Ligand binder design. Structure first.
Ligand SMILES: Cc1cccc([N+](=O)[O-])c1
Ligand SMILES: Cc1cccc([N+](=O)[O-])c1
Ligand SMILES: Cc1cccc([N+](=O)[O-])c1
Ligand code: FES
Ligand code: FES
Ligand code: FES
Ligand SMILES: [Fe+3]
Ligand SMILES: [Fe+3]
Ligand SMILES: [Fe+3]
Ligand code: NI
Ligand code: NI
Ligand code: NI
Ligand code: NI
Ligand code: NI
Ligand code: NI
Lengths: 437, 194, 194, 194, 437, 437
């Protein structure tokens, strides 16, 4: 698994998007080890509320406890291993297995066992048969992540330099709400193909989505045909130690939305920007109403502005279950919230006219990674190479001066390679000692 | 004929009254008229005449909606968060945008030309009891989409429509609603006009 | 029009006479009446109104039969053991039991609610030449069943029915026979009303 | 109703005029007559009465054609080599040969007997404006073929037909054309009568 | 493959129901070695009669010889390896290959070769090109089994202590008939998931089938909701050296059949019970009209009473072709035989209303065994543990005092583990020396 | 991978038609090393014309250059590995990637890169990012082949003794045209199952196609039922060092075509035969109007007479994408050319009434190769064994005196085994030193 990614994350073997054994290895070394997105507070707002989520290929029940905390458990009965919960979301103080009737609390404890007195007696210790719990659960401003590895860094440390860029929208804007349910669809592409596109692909927008830009008149029409850079400037791109990264297109608060969304959204963002400038400063207030496209390593992506939150749930090496949520700022008028939720699906949901364009990019890249000769071709992530900086006075992390750039591809794939070549977090840390140099 | 929803435990109040609507609303003439309408509409869409469809078959006031419903427990009543996401929820301008994306020569996905085949069945119709110019229409659709040599996707849907009679004799769609039956379609995308 | 089974070597005597039955039995009025009947029946089943179906569409004397035929050599005549297994062979009480299993709140399989979509085509009908209250009906069915996010099963069948006119104007099923075309369905189960 | 092919950029001139043909050609009586015709034809084929089909439903002058069209760029005009291969392009004698291969007791593939089910939908018809004995017919077909326990193939097609009225009241096929929508069918073969 | 099952068969790794490589290993060590159900005399009653059967993933032609014996052969031509027979059952004195026309007898011998004289001459030795024969074919009261391993114990020894429990119905009742054709359907579950359910799952009936019990009013309504044990007593469960086992629910001759079957069946069974008591004694005559649910290792299961005979034919690690026959007692009135045959399919055939309930139990257990994290969860087979006996005066084998119990799961999985960790029968025997202790 | 084929290619393990790992190995050792059919001059006759072709599992763009030569390139962008071309054939002077807009010439060179000046500058060297080229492209009388291995023998040497048999039709008849587009269909069989059938299976015709012979009255009716050899004689079969081989059925110019094609075709062939006899001699002029069935190793097959050209494109171990072209002699009347093109599809295209017969031969052989017990059965290729000659005065190569024979199976499988047991061409040559002895 060494040398699938070259130094500085400059090149990647195409095979990584199609190799079956590597996929199995990722389940052991990416998905068993890293922080994975579960849900938002606003989807499990009351005691007993739960959602099903995937963590890699496994499924977990994520449950709001009576004390207000959140716990998550593998969705598997401890008796004969039947799946416990079939609803995607709901409210319950417990979960009963339909096979033999074992009853668990929302806290994962085995509470009731039919025929316990008559047939089990002391042949059963219920305290040893609670649901298998996800040992690490943390949040970032309402966004809840889980990790199978008790040794993982705290979520905030894991976000590293990326957190600074997220805070204007995620922290300082007065709270977000994740709008459910998500769109869900299966795409015949590797999870990494989506992750790389969202982490840093400003370059594709003007070309892949040329027709969509013409039709909807998104603010991104400025880069149509990849003919000119945005009049606002080339923007920024950043990456971080644990692999998360993103681009910034200045001022593009309406993102991939069509012209009918632009005036109202722009007015809302400009108004809050003026207030925010006094609290967090001009630059960061501008970030608040800019378009950020990024990936929270490994497989959670987002757009700000055209507010989207995505999970690339792996099924196999050439198959991904794609989840699409919208998010909104809590203090938006309710009508605007509804319009935003629909506009997200309209561009990038299962029937999204932009996302359709992307299918063949993602799917054929992944299918070519399966083919004998083609799998040995390198992908190149050279855009901006040799010009990234670290320790800039204003902008933290490893930063390039263009959102049309591959700074964040390089960081994503560096972290990826460090993980697949490591057996644990300690080894990842050793492999990442000089990440920014 | 009516459904007793206390005994018929699986039937929603919504579906029960819809069934009754279409049962008592049966009219032989209307059945043949609406069957012809939906066959013409499907032919037009199959040959990808999207502008002709939007201009001639779709009303200015159109609401074109396809939902995906989150799977909830039949006994879990307490959880009240929105249970439906709009895969489509389009007005006329939004359909216009989708149509103009469709025929743009730089729509890379449409080259080589994709093949559509639509199968419309189980047509029923009923004139609205208040607004007689409004026709309630239900029909089932199988849509076969083939492209790129070996890609085949098959969609299955029930379309719940309201159509309106126009001055001059035309009939245009004012609402289409689809509760898409597969929660996670395994069709790459749902970028088809159901 | 008749089939010559000496020249048409693949056609069974049974199928040849059935074809003739439905050919000479064509009646335009009956065609539209029976098409409406089967569309109503399919709608009722799609919304899972199983009690309404059993009470209003199914006669007390019902035989509801779906067979799976063992594959035998077209030239092996000597082996005479039963060649058909009854996947269904139900009287009214047996349908009642299946219906009550369907709507029991402790039917774990039915939660979350399953989605059914039925496509009925190729309807033909013929009044029985002896019992004019009996209508012979043939129709083809595609049944799409979706559940649990990514489970999709599609069934394909020809239903050979006898329906009976009732005092008051109703029509109820007295026999349905399906020779299920796939010997080993790859659909998890066949627990659907064809 | 007509399609403006300058604005409707995805529509071929051929498909646009065909649409118009079938739009203005609508006749209620003809619709029911042709629906009955295609239902009878499909029944006959489903029971494998191929000789009866060839004798009674197919005219001596038959051209029975199914093409597979090579995928070409919508913008690549210069390359002019033939873009269609004939999977079928049969005259009466050639159909006769295929039919006699079908019922030969030494056709190993046909043992055990294969199961066919045809679903015909979206029927439209128009009398030819010059030759009134000629009926233009369009219909969509799903064909399910099952054999050998677990082999299932499903075909999807639009049949573009010319039928001719015969002295005595019969109607026979003089041309069937299918532009098969999947460039590389994943069905083992296409040895079915569409 | 060691330690997939713990001592005394107490726990099993969930992975066993989903692991691809283990499946391949089972073909070498379970299906290549053990006795596999083929057919019953009553399905090939005359010379030349044959049925197709599966033995693991392979297919065999099982043929009644002219001398009245039964031989079975791989369904594969010795020339270029084309499948020879496509009918599921029939009558023939020979089988001709459709490829080039080689003709074999019903005894597997190569009899005719087109162009033998003109083109082969002595370049062919027909005596060396007979169909590949199944070397071991034995029966148990009309039920015919095959084995690929010439070293296997005799079938009767292989049934071990299980045979005693089977004899009242199988031996002493005057003969059985297997009613064909079987129902066949493909289920997305591992073959073992069905095998464990039928070997000993009295526990699931009251819970999984609660709705079916209410609707049909089966005698099993006594255990509905797992609220009370049967008024007749907890019943029995047993297991044996080579892995076969079963439960006994006293008196439940109508089994999973609905109320409309109960009076007539109960009357028939009670009448023969009275006659049998004088020949084989009260206890065994009662067993005759009781409900036995069991598995004849590895993948043949049965119910007595509600007379079913099942084969879990493996396709892959998550796919099984399920066969369902009814059986009847030969001296039943013909109308009762027909009613029984239909009632079996009605409960547990491809459209069976009970079997439907089971799908999600079996399928999700198997799918969870494929998932990385979930596959490491243990299934527990602890019901009755610490209370099983051996060498009881009346009841032979390893026996527990409840049909709601996991005695037979433990025996099934012990034998399973012994086989997967062995290269041959001799090694299995060494691994099984202390099976009952 | 040793001993999958026995000495002299006499037997083959059935497993070869179903083993997954062997398939992967073939991609490395058959498809990476050998000459693979691409297209004919007549399908890319003008500068800028291109076709897509498969080379094993990979896809290549085969392009007519401005200077009249032909080059071929993997259909994969050098940026992020998106598939470049989606049309099957066309005309273009360049190919633009739909992802980010990189533009390549028809010569594979990277010509245009959006934002090159603004964002790349010298971070890009276009000269290092041309499409991955197929290093070897050669033709045989208009038929163009490609090879991934620069070390391969010249195409003419690779055809070896087979070329002599091909020349009357391919070289001396005045030129051929390949008629496109091909029929394409997916069949659930291993690529080798088709390759062996076409290389030498005269034996199957009279049996497999008995019904087709009766119905269409092809000249092959002489061998119907495998009852009698052709009145013209048994014919010939040959094989060659690099694995290509074929049979010859004397005089059968109309091949698998029905009676309606026979008179006109026979008249055309007899007329040119008379002219050709004076240029190339009686025997070779007769070969010109005979039926040759063969395989150009590994996966390109042909029939002369009933002029077909086939490619068995591997998808996986049990899946093949079958391509069917017709070919015609350039000087045939245009109406006859059209009739021939249709007649080829009518017999052996996706809806071909002969090819249908073959499906179950190919598919079940391959499926049996997947099954544990059945996979250990040997296929036998013994027809004609012990009677093949080398160095015959008239007929070159290893030659048997019957087209109903397995001479060419043995040669095909010898070459196959030599390749799978070799790491390169040098090792193949060493393994093939005594091929004819
Ligand atoms: C830069 C970028 C990256 C992924 C997705 C989008 N988008 O849809 O707007 C934009
Ligand atoms: C105890 C048991 C085990 C498997 C199946 C059934 N059943 O269907 O009655 C009962
Ligand atoms: C001898 C042979 C081999 C393969 C195919 C044919 N054919 O179709 O005529 C003939
Ligand atoms: S598997 Fe859950 S209670 Fe038994
Ligand atoms: S493969 Fe059976 S005769 Fe040749
Ligand atoms: S992948 Fe082709 S231009 Fe980027
Ligand atoms: Fe995009
Ligand atoms: Fe059960
Ligand atoms: Fe053949
Ligand atoms: Ni509704
Ligand atoms: Ni117009
Ligand atoms: Ni019938
Ligand atoms: Ni009622
Ligand atoms: Ni046309
Ligand atoms: Ni006739």
């Amino acid at each position: 698994y060494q040398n699938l990614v070259s130094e500085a994350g400059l090149t990647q073997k195409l095979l990584i998007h199609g190799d079956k054994e590597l996929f199995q290895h990722e389940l052991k070394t990416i998905f068993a080890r890293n922080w994975l997105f579960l849900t938002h507070d606003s989807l499990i707002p009351s005691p007993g509320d739960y959602v099903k989520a995937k963590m890699g290929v496994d499924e977990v029940i994520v449950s709001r406890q009576n004390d207000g905390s959140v716990r998550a458990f593998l969705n598997v009965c401890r008796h004969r291993g039947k799946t416990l919960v079939h609803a995607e979301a709901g409210n319950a103080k417990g979960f009963v297995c339909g096979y033999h009737g074992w009853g668990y609390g929302s806290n994962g404890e085995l509470q009731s066992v039919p025929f316990e007195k008559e047939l089990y007696g002391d042949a059963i210790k219920k305290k040893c048969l609670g649901l298998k719990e996800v040992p690490r659960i943390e949040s970032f401003h309402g966004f809840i992540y889980g990790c199978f590895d008790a040794e993982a860094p705290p979520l905030i440390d894991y976000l590293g330099d990326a957190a600074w860029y997220l805070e204007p929208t995620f922290k300082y804007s007065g709270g977000l709400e994740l709008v459910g349910p998500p769109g869900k669809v299966v795409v015949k592409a590797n999870w990494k193909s989506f992750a790389e596109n969202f982490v840093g692909d400003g370059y594709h927008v003007g070309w892949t989505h040329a027709a969509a830009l013409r039709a909807g008149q998104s603010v991104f029409s400025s880069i149509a045909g990849n003919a000119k850079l945005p009049p606002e400037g080339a923007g920024l791109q950043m990456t971080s130690k644990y692999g998360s990264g993103m681009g910034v297109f200045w001022g593009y608060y309406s993102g991939n939305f069509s012209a009918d969304m632009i005036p109202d959204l722009m007015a809302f963002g400009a108004a809050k920007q003026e207030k925010l400038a006094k609290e967090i400063g001009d630059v960061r207030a501008r970030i608040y109403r800019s378009f950020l496209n990024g990936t929270i390593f490994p497989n959670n992506s987002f757009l700000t502005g055209s507010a989207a939150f995505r999970v690339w749930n792996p099924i196999d090496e050439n198959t991904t279950e794609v989840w699409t949520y919208a998010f909104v700022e809590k203090d938006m008028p309710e009508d605007l919230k509804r319009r935003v939720a629909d506009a997200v699906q309209r561009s990038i949901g299962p029937a999204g006219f932009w996302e359709s364009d992307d299918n063949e990019n993602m799917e054929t890249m992944s299918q070519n990674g399966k083919k004998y000769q083609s799998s040995n071709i390198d992908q190149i992530a050279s855009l901006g190479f040799g010009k990234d900086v670290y320790g800039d006075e204003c902008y933290p992390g490893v930063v390039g001066k263009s959102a049309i750039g591959e700074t964040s591809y390089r960081g994503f794939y560096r972290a990826y390679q460090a993980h697949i070549s490591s057996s644990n977090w300690a080894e990842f840390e050793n492999a990442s000692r000089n990440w920014h140099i | 004929m009516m459904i007793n929803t206390q005994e018929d435990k699986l039937v929603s109040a919504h579906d029960a009254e819809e069934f009754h609507r279409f049962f008592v609303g049966h009219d032989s003439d209307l059945q043949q008229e609406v069957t012809t309408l939906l066959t013409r509409e499907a032919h037009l869409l199959d040959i990808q005449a999207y502008k002709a469809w939007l201009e001639h078959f779709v009303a200015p006031e159109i609401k074109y909606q396809v939902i995906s419903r989150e799977l909830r427990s039949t006994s879990e009543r307490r959880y009240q968060l929105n249970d439906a996401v709009n895969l489509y929820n389009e007005n006329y301008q939004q359909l216009k945008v989708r149509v103009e994306h469709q025929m743009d020569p730089q729509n890379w996905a449409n080259n080589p030309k994709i093949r559509f085949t639509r199968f419309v069945t189980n047509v029923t119709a009923a004139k609205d009891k208040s607004a007689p110019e409004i026709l309630h229409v239900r029909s089932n659709l199988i849509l076969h989409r083939a492209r790129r040599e070996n890609q085949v996707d098959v969609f299955y849907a029930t379309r719940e429509d309201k159509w309106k009679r126009i001055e001059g004799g035309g009939i245009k769609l004012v609402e289409r609603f689809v509760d898409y039956p597969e929660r996670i379609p395994q069709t790459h995308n749902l970028l088809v006009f159901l």
